[model samples]
Target: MKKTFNLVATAAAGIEAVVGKELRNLGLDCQVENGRVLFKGNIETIAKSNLWLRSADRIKIVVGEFPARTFEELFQGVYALDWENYLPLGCQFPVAKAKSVKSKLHNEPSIQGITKKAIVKKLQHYFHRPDSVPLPENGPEFKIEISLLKDQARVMIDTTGPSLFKRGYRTEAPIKENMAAAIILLSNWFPDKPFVDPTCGSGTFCIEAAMIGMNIAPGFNRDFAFEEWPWVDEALVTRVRNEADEQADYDIQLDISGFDFDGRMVEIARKNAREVGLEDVVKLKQMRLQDFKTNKINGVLISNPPYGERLLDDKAVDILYNEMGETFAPLKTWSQFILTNDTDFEQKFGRKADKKRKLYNGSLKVDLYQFYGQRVK
Candidate 1:
């Protein structure tokens, strides 16, 4: 029988609920925190979470949590855990990160150093190796972290090596893929609805929608850190992957399209879409946002448009937003969701949003302005 771990799917600030919803959809009970979702499962669950979770940053194992006021307390706290269960002998178990909240342990470097020392001593004792002779630091990497919150230290191990956002697809493609998926989920789009990304630089939004519409596991093309662990069964990985692959619905016809003003960007978007085997699925074209037109009803148009930092800067951006308002005005039955850093977007768009939401595109804060369309048929 495999050991069950306390798993966590860490996420960006605003999407914890979406991650929780995803876990629930996977049939796992989870609790949403500020920036992460907590759950429990065995290796199969871990593999599934990493494989299928589209909005999470990474899947991790919460090794242990303890209150440590001083370095001695921290040492004993870390030293007392059953380190042998997680870290293998002679493996490179680096204390990859350490954090100091409003706690007694205010010094992060000292906090990091002591946590590393405690793990080393515990492993030294667990493996029955002497402290005088150094242990070989070569093997599969097990990245660990110690997070101090109000003097309570929570140690965790990263199972998803890089991040879930890296869908083996290129590449920021602009707004992160996971974020784009979350935004789409938050929208009123169904698999049958038409979808478009007006300023689809590299086409993250449209590609994400296409993937979601087709039920493709976003992380299918990526390998995780836990796959290499000595404790994880190789057969189980293959089984989970095969099952997930079987779940994807390629037969579903999706009406997704992406457009950009720059023909170069359109070419890049096409190249990226083909990279993920989505070339024949999502429609890519070179056209200005104002040129976008559709007779279709109840479509979703999501845009993470250019910010003022672009070469055109504020004056151009304001005019662009004004143009967006004029262009989008006619799509009375098509809901529009636009993400922007501009706070005065409502005035420029010439209409107030039916709803607004706060989300972070990396560290920069942005808002999702939602304009729900009326279907008067």
Candidate 2:
């Protein structure tokens, strides 16, 4: 079990540091880079990382990395990797993705093709088979990906099938689970503090806060791509998941609530909470932003309001923002975290943010506007 491999936990843009912290928290020494965190781990580590990492988009095994300026360089580079360790004779190994930027070899499909040809040869030669015989592609898939930037190519295998944020829930959350978790972690909010999402569509923030409060593993209910790989021991998945299950703080009481104006969304959110067995742990209701009020102190109010560009009139959004400003103005002891693509948020909210962080809803650029609350002893 001491066999280690070069691993990466990929993150959404601007949240790589958060993923790095998550790795460190999981007791892995990691290096944070542009869109991923690098660490060394064995199979057990792979299991645990896939089961526990909250903000990571996916985890991958870095099979090899080398400079490949030409097609032959790419071919030889791919051929050099020990394919026998990763793929067996009958396994379906596909070079699933090939991306190139600022590199000499720009044809994406050819890059994919050359990489596959190299791997096919390596596997055949390692198994001591003749070149005339075709390799079988009739086993569990081992999908491969090769990406080159500035002439350096990285070969990776996805350990995560769907992204980590697809936590076996019912409805699609407006703010993804990973981003919601990142936002909560970024704020000064703690498990002991009360939490609210005044515009909680699908109850993502509320559910995430409850899970965080109860120390629930976000991936506990999901299946990973690695689990299907023949090389990954089946019992290892059970061991890691059981450990996560034992560490869960279910006895702790959490004060979390989600409110949405639409009754249908509230019902959907309720079903989602129930899907994860968090219905009782989190409160969901049909309530308008203007109607939300609380006497709680030192709480966090996270909002992912509707951006004007999507599904709303600009003038209506402005009115809604003004309403939010008026509504949240009285909660002096509650910190507010709002996410939107609107640049004029502060102007409409009637207060400048205490802190502002930029993030992507992967492709859509948005800002996280934070308003820190006053502390009372």
Candidate 3:
């Protein structure tokens, strides 16, 4: 019999739908919520989701949920669940985090403590051990998370060790890999089309584009937290990984390029790209954005330019936008997608966007201004 479990793919504020779409692409029916997508699948689905989900923040297992207005209620709620199924003897179970919002139990520390105590008590009873006998927790770690909203408590287990954004190629850049993947997906560009990022900071967009074009799993080169769990079969994990490897289209040629004004950043981008074995697939160049001119018709330009608040001054940013307007005007057949927090982006760029989507770059709210090009016959 196949054992199925409830899973949640936690996402950023504006990209929940994108994550939901990705999950559906992976052949799972999902219910999209504000900051998460709920789905159910067996153990193999866990491995597949961890490897294939490009835009989700983390993959968590939904343990249980119940209403709890008091500490005793919280204790009882957590203790009632079948923790033995998830946590084995000598396994390390820690209340990694707790959240309380608009609930009677607003004290987060107290809630965390009570939840931990309840789990420990349940474990002691199930293992037939006394209070004096402490369970030695020197084995695999199972990070537990609790959330309280409107007096309803939801418990989950963190299956993704680091967030999905940590694709293991980042040295130093603010552009998250998952967000980069989302931006590429939002552009709706095909793999054969030429893709360019004029202000590529750490070459994240171009590298991610190369990965997508080649059908490489974003989590292919990294380790996941669920691999060490006792319930998850290691052989199944190995089989899933092999299936992912077999699915990759490594022979496809990618026409992705990244350019930056700083030579130092160009070297950094190259190093990061090399780390992920995408050094040859993603071309990196050091040149000013205004100097970027491509004759390739119907190509896509996606960029995460510096916001005036952090990286550059207002005057410089405005000048750069104006330069973009002038430089990009000649390439009428090329589509443009720029992400920035400046509300007057279209005005400064001397044109209006064909469409705009609200997205978050970290905590700062930004808009992805998209300009469409003529459809190729």
Write the residue-wise lDDT of candidate 3 on 1-377 in tens digits: 12778999988878998898899998999999988999999888889999999899899999999999999999999999888888888999989568999999998889999999999989999999996677889989999999999999999999899999998988764678888899899896888899999998889899889989999999999999999987788789999999999999999987999899999899999999999998878999999989988888888999888886777888999999999999988878888999999999999999999999999887889999999987656
lDDT of 2 by residue, 149-210 (tens): 99999999888888998888856437788999998888888888889998888888888888
Q: Write the per-residue lDDT of candidate 1 for residues 77-170, one digit (tens) a residue.
A: 9998778888888788888557888998988888888988998998888788897677898899989888999989999999999888889889
Give candidates' CA RMSD values in order. 1.9, 1.8, 1.5
Report the lDDT of model 3 for residue 328: 88
Question: Whole-model lDDT for model 2 versus the true structure?
Answer: 0.88
Which residue pairs does candidate 2 place in steric collision? Answer: none
Shift of residue 317 alpha carbon in model 2, Å: 1.6
Tell me how many clashing residue pairs each candidate has.
0, 0, 0
Better of 2 and 3 by lDDT: 3
- Most accurate candidate by TM-score: 3
Give the runs in model 1 whose Cα sits over 4 Å from its true position.
171-173, 308-312
Q: Cα miss at 323, model 3 (Å)?
A: 0.5
List the global CA lDDT of all models.
0.90, 0.88, 0.90
